[PDB]
């Protein structure tokens, strides 16, 4: 129904990503039959029919719907036009590269896990989210009428966040220098800058999305308008007809013929004029048809359990808060994982010094425990002595003692790095900035749609 | 459409077992959700609608349908009467112990496999079967007219099987000293002995089944007829109803239901009427057909059991070939592991003198250690250098030696192999046998 301020995902979308991730259906590995996926998604999680899940998978696999795709589909997923997808038995899919970042650090006991629908598995309430998916991909939902969060540019949302990490009480106008307004994957041209401001602090506003119309003059002293990109959600199926209905049922000037020059390597459309036709005709196509239409914002996401009208300021302020809980947890999990390893490695350094004495001690024993409990002499532990008896002959070679010497150093510096992030939160916030720029530099794509 | 002679299963029934076993949903373990079972069976093996799979899976868990059930269901799947089941949402299931005996030796490269409906995975063409599910559980379908194979007693089928192993040219009469007729999980009594024999040699037979009717003479000379068990495939929902339609439009001389149906100086001719005009006594028709060579074939007792014995030998011959090679690929390793504990210090003090793992394996020209054998030495645990974990390595050498020696004998003589079959079938009989219901 509605997404939450943190990961920006609606319930169904989250189950999809987690399922496909659990089954190891990632970007680097081979595509999987959607029928199997939707079969594991419905069987273990989300039961509300098959045709509710595959519906979501296909939306996430459309670059013309989401700014940065979350699912990658091979087969009929639909075209830039109002074209339909084939059934689940006929397509194969996997996750995108970037989707792996929403799920990155899940194993580290970072996010809260809730109990399954039929109480069998365990599923995440939120995904760790290495990027702010809420502004990046947007949302359309339930709640009164219908919510509308528009998609923004990945790179621009990152900059805004990095600014608000250092400046918590950041004024809305400053943020607008990093994220000036929305960025639609369908392009277009957004107007009303003073109206976008209202959308950013409160959540409502009207903006008007014009199409990037380019005029190129042809033979016989005539002109001819060509639409390079039409607005978001709006299809060129019945809009191409709505423009033809103005000439066939003549309401203006020299509107001659309307021909759709489709999309292959680009969108192309209106051979207007034939000889001396006004461009005041263009204003009729704007005001009457959906060639230009108002996009109303209504930014609502679930906050702390309850739905709440939100703006750019608290969306980002709820994102940074989540990321710190995820990072503080990632670190706490690894500090423990690294201390548990260090101990064993320290004991493994000891058995390398008294090698020949410990060779005879294990040889002159009876069983495994008569080797483990016989390791009273240095003082080893249950897990440390376990680790010595369960060490192989190859680990006692030249290279495997040297690589083991460097693992100790690598481990002690990790614990040292990890203790700083937990101890001082100033440096934790600096890891957040570094990780997000590490994400920006890899997935940044320049903006479409003028302002 | 028709079951397979060898394992007595229809493609859907097989798919259920194979899918459930791979997902570790066996008897010893917990009852896994029915939705997940069907979901995996559909997504990986059978794409012909969910309600066709659950129905098959619900049938193999009803003790009023299959004699020795292959699926075990916790909750509502229907009672002894015509009581309806629940939905896949409200049930949970697993396989029964005896079902595991059909899948016994699956992974041992025993049975032929075939690719998926979408060429994604591998599914078996037949199960390795340790008991003849064709006679033991039967089948009712459509193959011409309708195909019908009745359920029989496990023990009696095994006795007949062991005789057929020892006497290939077995006569139908001698065979009926072991297997005297069908055994329905509903009870009753089967008449027409020579008609059972007609079925066992040809495939078709009209025998007539009758109910178990005992007399209950109550208070003041008044009598009442009590039915203990009604015949097979006959529901008592319509039968108790048609025995009410006879007293309403009185064609004879009350009726209550408790399996127990209870019916002044009325004659014992009502019993004879109710036998001829209702389904309390009906003609059961045999029509034993199954897929042999990839085509339906009308089959008698002898060629059913012949196809079974012929199957069981290839399973065993293939099981033994798998295991002889496994124990050969392991003895070769063990022999090197004893050759090293004799020159203990020389191997420890050579590996330490080496660079890496592979440079230590190449240094094993100290007698001549092979690739797979050298892998085991460098990847050997330090706990395997203690007395008890070296003593067992001498017993292992001996076990592997006696295993190969025992196995090699089974493959080299098609006589001692048959003796292993008889043995195995007798092991199964000893464990799952149950006294027979119904009579002659």
Author numbering:
A (entry chain B): 29 to 171, 173 to 298, 300 to 407, 409 to 482
B (entry chain A): 29 to 171, 173 to 282, 286 to 290, 296 to 300, 305 to 407, 409 to 482
Passage from the reporting paper:
Bacterial genomes usually encode two type IIA enzymes, topo IV and DNA gyrase, each composed of two subunits (ParC and ParE in topo IV, GyrA and GyrB in gyrase) assembled into a functional heterotetramer i.e. C2E2 and A2B2, respectively. Both enzymes act by passing a duplex DNA segment through a transient double-stranded DNA break in another helical region. By contrast, topo IV is a decatenating enzyme that resolves interlinked daughter chromosomes following DNA replication. For example, though gyrase is the universal target of quinolones in gram-negative bacteria, topo IV is the primary (or dual) target of many quinolones in gram-positive pathogens such as Streptococcus pneumoniae, a major cause of pneumonia and other serious infections.
To gain insight into the mechanism of S. pneumoniae topo IV and its interaction with DNA and quinolones, the structure of the ParC55 fragment has been solved and the model was refined to R = 22.30% (R-free = 27.55%) at 2.7 Å resolution using wild-type ParC55 data (twinning fraction = 0.323, twinning operator = (k,-h,l)). ParC55 forms a biological dimer in a ‘closed’ conformation in this crystal form generating a ring-like structure with outer dimensions of 100×100×50 Å and with a central hole approximately 30 Å in diameter, which is wide enough to pass a duplex DNA. Each monomer of ParC55 contains two distinct regions labeled ‘head’ and ‘tail’ and exhibits an overall structural fold similar to the one observed for other topoisomerases. The N-terminal proximal head contains the CAP-like (catabolite gene activator protein) DNA-binding domain and the ‘tower’. The residues Ser 79 and Asp 83, which upon mutation give rise to quinolone-resistant pneumococci, are located primarily within the helix α4 in close proximity to the active-site tyrosine and are oriented towards the predicted position of the bound DNA. In the closed conformation, the ParC55 monomers form a tight contact between the α3 helices with a mean center-to-center distance of 10 Å resulting in the protein-protein interface with a buried surface area of 706 Å2. In the ‘closed’ S. pneumoniae ParC structure, the loop is positioned vertically and stands on the side of the DNA-binding groove orienting the active-site tyrosine towards the expected position of the DNA backbone and exposing the active-site helices (α3 and α4) to the predicted protein-DNA interface. S. pneumoniae ParC55 folds into a similar closed conformation to that of E. coli GyrA However, interestingly, the DNA binding site formed by the pneumococcal ParC55 dimer differs markedly in its electrostatic charge distribution from both the E. coli ParC and GyrA dimers.
